[PDB]
């Protein structure tokens, strides 16, 4: 397997609403378990905020009460969160977890991905994808992942058969208010001549695709 | 609400340490005969994973080298022999009552022998030089312990304030650490000067290593 996936983070406006889903494979029957949202806000530790259960009972953390409702829709096995009235203290990873039983009480068997929310007036921007070209027996290459927003981005190698020797570095927040990142990997320098080596960038935001050659020199 | 403390907040251990960490509950979380404490395990970029429900017992799959253990307020995780796979942040969670709460997380690190970093430096991209600003990247790779120093020199004069940071995360494999430090020059000031150089500074090392290139080869 059963698998949760979240949909609807992105970037909010303070003052505005945000409206995630969670989408449950649909093989799952849903009617043994709770539904819940459980947020992170980075660097920050775990709040869970919403659950429903079957017979709609809702339980809300009262941290958030009052701006906050989570709903669902069994025709489409979906939960959906909805908070209003967002803040900075909003921005987190939204995770759906589904609860399974013990002796009458919930604990979170099974989580989601998670989705970004981030709450911010500024504008969506995607990046441009810059080569690290390489210039002992290894080499490092990479590619540079520059001004962009807002997180997040993610990074392949030749479409993922590459990802031994992968570091892809967090993101720094840049003077401007932009995101940078480089992802860099080691490879025998033996194969600088045969291999192909593709960075695959992702900065869906900005519906950014890229897939870069880094070659030598 | 029930606050959860947990103890240590971090900690390093070496692969094949017992590790043991601590919950501390502001009220019993027993309810007729079974206390309601369970934990997970958050890697960097992943939804937390739950190891242990009903304070003791192991969600199915978990590696047995996992237990916990405790009542009332009082409850413990431990890690048998700690393999390097385990860096992460471990959460331990009370369901008693609504609000179902999290600790704020324990930190556990690896442990291991100093490892020198590996330097590399990459001149700025044509591609992106057109665009009218230089990034000078300078990658430290697979070291151990994470603290270091990186000091720009263009021209040998010693740069501030025009670099950036940023540390992967501990190295689930090897538990190592990789660095990558920018600097961020225009256009116009990047090609007024000749050498550029990073110069590392780390336990491993007994004195700084510098990598370097001078400007269109």
């Known amino acids: 397997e059963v698998q949760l996936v979240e949909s609807g983070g992105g970037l909010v406006q303070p003052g505005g609403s945000l409206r995630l889903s969670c989408a449950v494979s649909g093989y799952s029957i849903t009617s043994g378990y709770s539904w819940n949202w459980i947020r992170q806000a980075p660097g920050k530790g775990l709040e869970w905020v919403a659950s429903?259960?079957?017979?709609?009972?809702?339980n809300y953390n009262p941290s958030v009460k009052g701006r906050i409702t989570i709903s669902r829709d069994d025709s489409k096995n979906t939960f959906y969160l909805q908070m209003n009235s967002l803040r900075a203290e909003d921005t987190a990873v939204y995770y759906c977890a589904r609860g399974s039983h013990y002796f009458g009480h919930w604990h979170f068997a099974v989580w989601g991905q998670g989705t970004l929310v981030t709450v911010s007036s500024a504008s969506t921007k995607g990046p441009s994808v810059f080569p690290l070209a390489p210039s002992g027996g290894t080499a490092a290459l990479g590619c540079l992942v520059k001004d962009y927003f807002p997180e997040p981005v993610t990074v392949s190698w030749n479409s993922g058969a590459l990802t031994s020797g992968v570091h892809t570095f967090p993101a720094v927040l840049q003077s401007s208010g932009l995101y940078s990142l480089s992802s860099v990997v080691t490879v025998p320098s033996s194969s600088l001549g045969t291999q192909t080596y593709i960075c695959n960038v992702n900065h869906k935001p900005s519906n950014t695709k890229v897939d870069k050659k880094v070659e030598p020199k | 609400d029930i606050q959860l403390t947990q103890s240590p907040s971090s900690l390093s251990a070496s692969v094949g340490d017992r590790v043991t960490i601590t919950c501390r509950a502001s009220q019993s979380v027993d309810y007729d005969g079974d206390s309601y404490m369970n934990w997970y395990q958050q890697k960097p970029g992943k939804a937390p994973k739950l190891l242990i429900y009903?304070?003791?017992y192991l969600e199915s799959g978990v590696p047995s080298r996992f237990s916990g253990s405790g009542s009332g307020t009082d409850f413990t995780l431990t890690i048998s022999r700690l393999r390097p796979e385990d860096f992460a942040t471990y959460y331990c969670q009370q369901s008693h009552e609504d609000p179902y709460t999290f600790g704020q997380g324990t930190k556990v690190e690896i442990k291991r022998t100093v490892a020198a970093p590996s330097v590399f430096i990459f001149p700025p991209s044509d591609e992106q030089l057109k665009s009218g600003t230089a990034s000078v990247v300078c990658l430290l790779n697979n070291f151990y312990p994470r603290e270091a120093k990186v000091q720009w020199k263009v021209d040998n004069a010693l740069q501030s304030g025009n670099s950036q940071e940023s540390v992967t995360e501990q190295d689930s494999k090897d538990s190592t650490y990789s660095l990558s430090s920018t600097l961020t020059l225009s256009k116009a000031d990047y090609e007024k000067h000749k050498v550029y150089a990073c110069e590392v500074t780390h336990q491993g090392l007994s004195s700084p290593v510098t990598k370097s290139f001078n400007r269109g080869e």
């Open positions: 009903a304070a003791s």
């Open positions: 429903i259960t079957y017979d709609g009972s809702t």
